[PDB]
Symmetry: D3
Subunit: 299 residues, 6 copies
């Protein structure tokens, strides 16, 4: 079972302007083959399907816990996309939009028209080409070593996509999110590498980083490393998955320092609200009446 | 952000027999168009994409919270499929399996060969025809009324699929899960109906049940209604989403009794472990050495 | 614009037995790559997209008219599938079905479980592997000769699929439909062949039949040829598409006799009603109340 | 069975210039999830699969007849797309196009290159992202109330897509078509709402409009309402489906006026011919010889 | 079984500048429905599945040999796409690229972002809309006449796509490749047409060309015709498939001259190397160390 | 550019019986996610897309050469499927088949009806659920280390699928092919492991075998190891890719013996011909006339 906390894993800066094509590129990190939907659903199904949950408990705890962190990653990437598509962030009411004045004319010429037609200028479950995420992006073989090898590859392939998207947009909301997730992805790759070392004797973490560029060369990632976040494996559970530290110990591949298990989630930051976009009819064309109904429910 | 508890939402009975084609039908309720992956991902993305999170807070809390419940529903359906596919449930070691003796011969003739080739006799992210779940099963329009109307429909279409699968298998593990999820789906359809009533004045809950058969006629659902679970909207959050009761109030469509918000999750039941299946190499062909490595991690 | 007549293009025999796997194979002829949805949608979009509607009028009339015939072919194939899936054909009410008695147990083991879970034991828009029909099965290049060459191929590939399905089931409902559509497909292949002959001088009709087996060797097709239906290109329009006979003239490839344009549709046969299937909740679990509401609409 | 009339459901204005990206957006209303292919094929298959065709005849007549109207809607949307892609509308012959002069250079940079490579600058069976229409967009459950609830939702979701596309293009051919189909979609949603009211007692039409913007605020839709088209359910059959008026009666949700069944189709307008586009080889590179062959067939 | 020669079927000119949208269009000729993956895989599977390999040997030889030529065609189209995407062709090392300077900013706005995110600015197995090539583009019925009729259609449909893409780009690398493949596709269509003539008596080659524009009107194709390449069916095998000349004989549909079987492959041209693209991390962010490792392997 | 030799990479045994559901499972090894189409197309496109073809020549030669071997692997798997589907292997003519006698009746109930409807009882480009192979199964990142890590994983995942299919069928044609390809896949995984060792210093070959079962425990694989085929990396090129031995050197992970580069392809075995199947119209309903036309081409 799961619980939800109404906070993003980090504070994101507010967007300054809409950037549809940047949002279309960041979609690769949500619903593309190596996006956060893929890391999430791989680890989630592997955790359900895991055989030997007590006999191999440290490895089960690792996969089950990292799966839970990835729920917050899809949330963070979606918030970033929604920030890049928000017309009036934090504003509950915009008046005077006339459909006959062609208020979505700009959207005719952007890469991803579905953001504006199918979504209400919001994230969709797709990648950078409009390809919808699909369940064949999940690998759940039941064999522990094979699944772990897959997962090590998955995290470094996902890092490669993150780096390429970082190089396509200078938007600060996108770059803050990518910088943070580069650091978290390094933790995941190191954790799966340490798991493989323990089972096979092969020094998988010595292969990192892939590609051969250090996270410290990305300014936003370096800030999170200076805060220690490459050391931290957070235990996203009230009482379970306590044997993480049997695998998550020893040196960080980033800088040789000792890694730690943090009990509990980070404090994080506020959730994002894109505000009213009348031309998208979101949350309504004119939501004044709905706001009144909601206020009356409290009375 | 999210937290995880290592418990299923209910206790499942232990499986007595492998039933591959029952597992292949139950996959409709996991990764088909109207399966639990669809209810989960619809409400999850709607909750991310929600505009007016404070100004429309009771409606946001509702969607965000039900999305969280659906995480435990994909977990429960996956455990059920895994139970139907398990050869040696709860047994850590089986010895003497020889690949050349054709130990997976039976799987040549079952509907879903992917369960045995791509999976290790385990759940996959697909429906009853092998079709993989896909993101176009999600509807996230940004318009509150339209999304809620979609969600009311989605829950009753999902109920229709659950009832049809229930009629295809008499396996007690599958029927226990379906009975419980019929009750929970009734709660969700009623909640979205009540939300629509509040916003539009249209008495959507008077349309229930769809199809026109009461949950009380399904014995495994009636068992859970007798314990009161059709009245409960659990708040799956330590501190957030506290305004659920502004919508989840009044009469249950099942029996006219007053519905309630429960703080926190249900007690639940234990997670399921399908045990060793050597022919699937799961968790390994012979996992003895891996078990020894894991034990040494504790000693160190 | 289009009009509808509440009749099938032929009378079908009444089904005597449910045959799920026969229905799953006949789906190839509805929603597979070379099924009737493909012939329909190819000619429909080609007719929309046609350039030179007046200057090339005889060719436009041909494509626009055959597209209209294909609407009745998807209808006929769907009726055949529904006949193979019907539990109580023509019976409005079945009583005493209890979901807990596993009334759909047989469907756990059939090839196509979607017919029973997603459909109400009814046709779906898919082929014989459960693959859903898709728009990339349409070819609409805008080039007349290339489109006609495609269409000639499409009809003979579709014929090949029909013959193979015919060889898989001896069900009389399926074989009657296939026999009739073999004759109609021969007309369409001959028509597109004659069109290509007129434009290129290449004697495309001399390539027929493909495969090299005559329709007269299939008893149900021979029945319809004995009534003359291989000679007839029906004009499915009140007043339009009158220049068909500029292409549809001369000898039939079947038997050398002169072909004819018939104004208007054939007489046809009655539409099919699969009746009540309570386990599928179709049209309702117990439709008595709905039948009463419908009767009261007339009294009012 | 079906019959065909060589007329569009309305007269469309002639296009002034090619607008490829507008055509790419309007494709959402043809082959996207909530396009006219979806309303068509949903009602068509529901009508085939309907159980109790005599016992529930008024409801069968409604679905079977609306399915037939939707055939004219795919035709109208295709004509609109073809108008937006037509280089020389109504011109049978253009001479002097040289392939080596790069006459399709502009198409390199448009959103939908398939319109120009796979089609001959013509409509395709796809949506606004190039996604091909697929049969899983059809819902045919066999349960009357569930199918009708789906269909009510389908029409208001489709209306939402129509409105968003309307806001992306000011092209008069697109706006005339959308204005007309907004009115027809309102009729369909009202008809399915009235059907649900009769079966369940739930006042579904009181939920309209969705989104909460009136069709009268869209100028092209208002013109068709002033002509009475929101009142009309046309019976698209010579002799069948005569019990429509048992459901299609009473007040229109738009303005409270009494609705009517019209016997027979509207008069409509002429079909569209995009003319010769030599660079697309459509209907041929130089069609002069083909035109001569066609003329000789008449002799 | 197969053997490989490290040469392209023709020499391609070097690219002058990156042209992403031209590459995105040329993808139609690689992984679209009528691209070279389709001609390749159709003939390959037909050759595997062929019944009567000795009794119908001339027809088997034809299909099996043309399948082998198509392997070189996917190679040539991929090289063309890679040329259009290459930043520093023939340069093994570029230094001084900083990810934080947004070196892939231009890629945010191009049609195909996957070329830069999923690929390392390289070809992918997809068409002009980002649609991935799929196995349902193969037709392998087992019936010889039906498969040959399909294949004749396939080659002329593919020619139509080649011509339309030619008209979208004036890039010399693309036009050289298309000009050559127009000539080779004419050979294939003529060969399948001659095969059908021999089996059915229907004069299929009299239908060529489709569309009705001669290859001689395309300057790059005319050059290859002046070199005689429309006459040549190359036998791509050391010792097998020697009965080609029983079908590939008689007159060319292009100019009436006698066609010939050439024993063995053409000499061709060098393979293409796009060089280092640091922002794509291809072959590495900084490959100096990898180059040193490779040099030491020789010692 | 490429050349073709009309030989399979090994001699296959002749089939004794049609086994449709075995063929449907073996399809996983052809057109599924981890089938031979995926190993082929991954290495083929990586070889096209390779940057630093001279500066990193040994690694280019490796990928370009293994891609060429994989062409013969799709050929071998297709021949195996065709063997399992062949009615009259090696027989050019069968007479007396009447379509109206339902000669494909058995195919109504098998898993993969497409083999008989869309194919002429022949291989298709799909996996074990009927899913068609697709281009997103290819990974071509341009980064050498990342691509090699992918390829090492791909070979061991493919091995896992081969072992599971081996356990589903005892058919000798399928098991001979699988035994040989287990040995060849071990060579490929070892080669990519050695390449990764050279570039990173990580001892990837020490992870093998995955799963933890040795090829020598599969009798048909052991047969080929006894002949030395696990030591051989064949150079499938007349004159190119000569620097393979800079990586393919040192110990075999199977048995510690020294591995070798062999110039040129193996001798191989004959290609397979499924013969005439009249009910599939393959190569024709009655191919006598076609055989006569072919013979006359030689006389002329
Ligand atoms: Mn992550
Ligand atoms: Mn991660
Ligand atoms: Mn649920
Ligand atoms: Mn629910
Ligand atoms: Mn037809
Ligand atoms: Mn036809
Ligand atoms: Mn409509
Ligand atoms: Mn409508
Ligand atoms: Mn080619
Ligand atoms: Mn070719
Ligand atoms: Mn292989
Ligand atoms: Mn391999
Ligand atoms: O991740
Ligand atoms: O991540
Ligand atoms: O991550
Ligand atoms: O759900
Ligand atoms: O559920
Ligand atoms: O649910
Ligand atoms: O057809
Ligand atoms: O047909
Ligand atoms: O047909
Ligand atoms: O519609
Ligand atoms: O519409
Ligand atoms: O509509
Ligand atoms: O080709
Ligand atoms: O080609
Ligand atoms: O070609
Ligand atoms: O492989
Ligand atoms: O392999
Ligand atoms: O392999």
């Amino acid at each position: 079972m799961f619980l939800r906390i109404d906070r993003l894993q980090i504070e994101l800066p507010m967007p300054k302007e809409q950037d549809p094509n940047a949002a279309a590129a960041v979609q690769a990190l949500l619903g593309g083959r190596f996006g956060e939907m893929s890391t999430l659903m791989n680890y989630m199904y592997q955790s359900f399907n895991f055989r030997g949950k007590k006999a191999l408990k440290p490895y089960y705890d690792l996969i089950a816990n990292i799966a839970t962190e990835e729920l917050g990653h899809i949330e963070l990437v979606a918030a970033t996309i929604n920030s890049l598509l928000a017309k009036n962030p934090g504003k509950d009411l915009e008046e005077g939009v006339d459909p006959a004045s062609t208020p979505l004319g700009f959207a005719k010429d952007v890469r991803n028209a579905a953001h504006f037609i199918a979504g209400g200028a919001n994230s969709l479950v797709m990648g950078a080409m409009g390809e919808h995420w699909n369940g064949e992006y999940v690998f759940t073989s039941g064999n522990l070593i094979l699944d772990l090898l897959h997962n090590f590859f998955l995290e470094v392939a996902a890092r490669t996509h993150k780096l390429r998207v970082y190089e396509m947009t200078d938007n600060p909301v996108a770059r803050e999110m990518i910088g943070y997730l580069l650091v978290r992805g390094g933790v995941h790759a190191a954790a799966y590498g340490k798991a493989l070392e323990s089972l096979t004797g092969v020094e998988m973490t010595k292969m990192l980083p892939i590609p051969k560029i250090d996270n410290s060369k990305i300014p936003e990632a370096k800030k999170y490393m200076d805060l220690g976040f490459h050391r931290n494996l957070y235990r996203f559970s009230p009482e379970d998955y306590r044997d993480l530290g049997l695998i998550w110990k020893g040196a960080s591949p980033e800088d040789g320092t000792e890694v730690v298990v943090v009990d509990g989630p980070p404090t994080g930051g506020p959730v994002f609200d894109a505000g009213h976009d009348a031309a998208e009819f979101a949350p309504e064309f004119h939501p004044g009446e709905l706001y009144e109904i909601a206020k009356k429910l409290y009375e």
